[PDB]
Design a protein around this nucleic acid. Sequence first.
RNA 1: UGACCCCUGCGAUUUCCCCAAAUGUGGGAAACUCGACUGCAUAAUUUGUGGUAGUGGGGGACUGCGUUCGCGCUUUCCCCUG
Lengths: 186, 77, 95, 74, 73, 81, 86, 81
Amino acid sequence: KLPHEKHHNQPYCGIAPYIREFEDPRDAPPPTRAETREERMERKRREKIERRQQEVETELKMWDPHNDPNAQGDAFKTLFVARVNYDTTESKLRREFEVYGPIKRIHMVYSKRSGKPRGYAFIEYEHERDMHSAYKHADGKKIDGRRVLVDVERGRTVKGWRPRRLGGGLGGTRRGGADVNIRHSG
Amino acid sequence: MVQPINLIFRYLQNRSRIQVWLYEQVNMRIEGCIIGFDEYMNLVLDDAEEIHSKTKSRKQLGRIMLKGDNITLLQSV
Amino acid sequence: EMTPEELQKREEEEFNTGPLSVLTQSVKNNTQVLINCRNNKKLLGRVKAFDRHCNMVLENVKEMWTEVKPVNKDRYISKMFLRGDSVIVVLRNPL
Amino acid sequence: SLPLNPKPFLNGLTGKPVMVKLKWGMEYKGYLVSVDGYMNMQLANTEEYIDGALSGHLGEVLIRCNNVLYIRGV
Amino acid sequence: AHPPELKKFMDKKLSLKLNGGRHVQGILRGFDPFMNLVIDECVEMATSGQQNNIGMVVIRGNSIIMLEALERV
Amino acid sequence: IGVPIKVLHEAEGHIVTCETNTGEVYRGKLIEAEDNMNCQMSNITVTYRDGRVAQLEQVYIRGSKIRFLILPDMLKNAPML
Amino acid sequence: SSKMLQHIDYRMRCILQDGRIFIGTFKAFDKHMNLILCDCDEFRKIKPKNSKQAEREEKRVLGLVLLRGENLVSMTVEGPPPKDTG
Amino acid sequence: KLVRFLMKLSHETVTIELKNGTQVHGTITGVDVSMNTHLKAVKMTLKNREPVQLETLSIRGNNIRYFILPDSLPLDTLLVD
RNA sequence: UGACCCCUGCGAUUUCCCCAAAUGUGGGAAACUCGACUGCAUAAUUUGUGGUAGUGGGGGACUGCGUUCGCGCUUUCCCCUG
């Protein structure tokens, strides 16, 4: 028959006569709440984050950024250059950054254990005014075919500043995929 | 060319007591002053009255809402 | 939807705070639940998983219904799969 | 009387007592908890009415949208 | 979302069939892709022989089953 | 589009039968067909669930509310089949 | 989706939501499950209200039929396709 | 989604109920996104009818009421995806 | 049916370099082009998330109205049937 002309001899009833659940104190099994390949990953993800964070506190107490033998000269005078090509000769780095002013001392950092060039150096100008002239001009320079950035070294100037390994620093060349453009420079 | 959306908007501004038929129910009808409507055709009334053809009793409901799928036919006053 | 991007997580927050959260806390706490379906029968059992379509994964269920004097009839199903469209009402353990 | 769409109206009914009648006569009155984009209603301290008369007390009740007939406050 | 080709029945007296064995009769004035029709000079045409004219009304396509044109278009 | 839809579009202009969810069966000449199964017919013969029949001149029916359709058997020779 | 492709042209019996059985040559289908049946015949089971009599079967020939998937419940092979060989 | 889990039950035995009260017990061979399932070597039992064993049956998803799965099914392991 | 061993999957088209039995047979790169492959608009009226619920039938005793005495409606208990 049709849905409209169908004589419902026993239409849908309520549920008032069908409340026979279990008592409250009869609680559910506590151990029956877990999932695989969902929490063990988060558990391992939390430790690696915390383990480093705990390791960070130990390094700050032992090593002092300001009290560094390599670092020398006035902090506001010194300059920082990174993304430098490994083949850049010391004279090439002097002659390219001397255009903005005379360089009192230049320090190219090297790997402690491997000895390889780190790729960034610290340039100390004779006058504080000579450095600032390079801050705007040096940034974006092209040395040995690879673009280089230049910013005042904040390791001993900016309060609450720290490098990558301590969670700070700048630049996102290795941040979330498709979130930091490689063309843009500091 | 007048469309149902524009016509429903007119009845709303006029605040006329629009009667509505139910889906699968011929015996039951509802009438009230429409307040608003969405793309889903759901209609809200300020003072609804449920009238049955057999019983002829008008049950007062007040400010209520009605599903669009249940609507079958609109009628003025 | 309001968020046409494929990375939209509207369904996520909906089951956590929306009306469908009754099933999440049931599977979380492993609490029983009574469901009224279009079969005029009531199904009392636990839930193990669900989605937006209101399709639950039940276990240890007990079907109950009545025919006609009115006689009651009940049976048991340890594992079954309930559809959403046929559902009318759901009721968790009010305790 | 400014136009009041159906969605804000139902949103205001949240937390207050509301009665809903189903397509098969049965009704349910309880404290509206929340709704979804499809109007899947969830009530609290719900009481089931059968053929208009009170049937019993249920509590928290989750009801789909395509089954309810209409909704009304109080 | 192609709409129905109801231009023929525009401004014609039709008799529509509804879901719950209900029928109406009026002149069509406009339609929509969802078959939402607005007919004027509509009669209720209840189960009994009684007739009740109200005029302009609206019908939801979800409930329209069949529509016949008494004026043969 | 779907193959059943194409078999319906090519069937336009011929006598076809259509049954609705309300039980009515309509047999007459087909005028217009659409991808959404909306069919327009002319001079059809309707059969109600009780068995009574009636006369119509020009009729249109929604596609979603059709149970099934009967088309001429000769359509089986279509190139797709 | 060879589950359906493998059955094209076979004599399948379609089960309707109302309880009817449409037996015809399954020609083609679609994503919506709208089938095309050739030489279809409609059967329906009528309850005996007079006495305990055998179920009454009322056959009805239709020919070519187009069934909407929404109204189709299930379908099985009643028999192989009409063999064209002698 | 959840229908993907339904498509993983091929070759296993279950008992599905239909919206018309019909019960169908057989082995699953394939399922689609629309919940339509194909069962081979299946037995159908219509309401007030006699059981019949069918070698194949393709059912639509709309007319399905619920399923009955085995007792030893690994839900915690099968619901990971 | 099938262990072991191979590709993680494209039908078509375009350009660079290279192996080469050198116009063919192949490899390393992308380019943006069709398929109805998938996700969301797809549970908001037209199929992929229900107003097609399945809610009975029959054999004995057991009421009434009309009656063509076959029956339509209507009120009860025990049984077979799903």
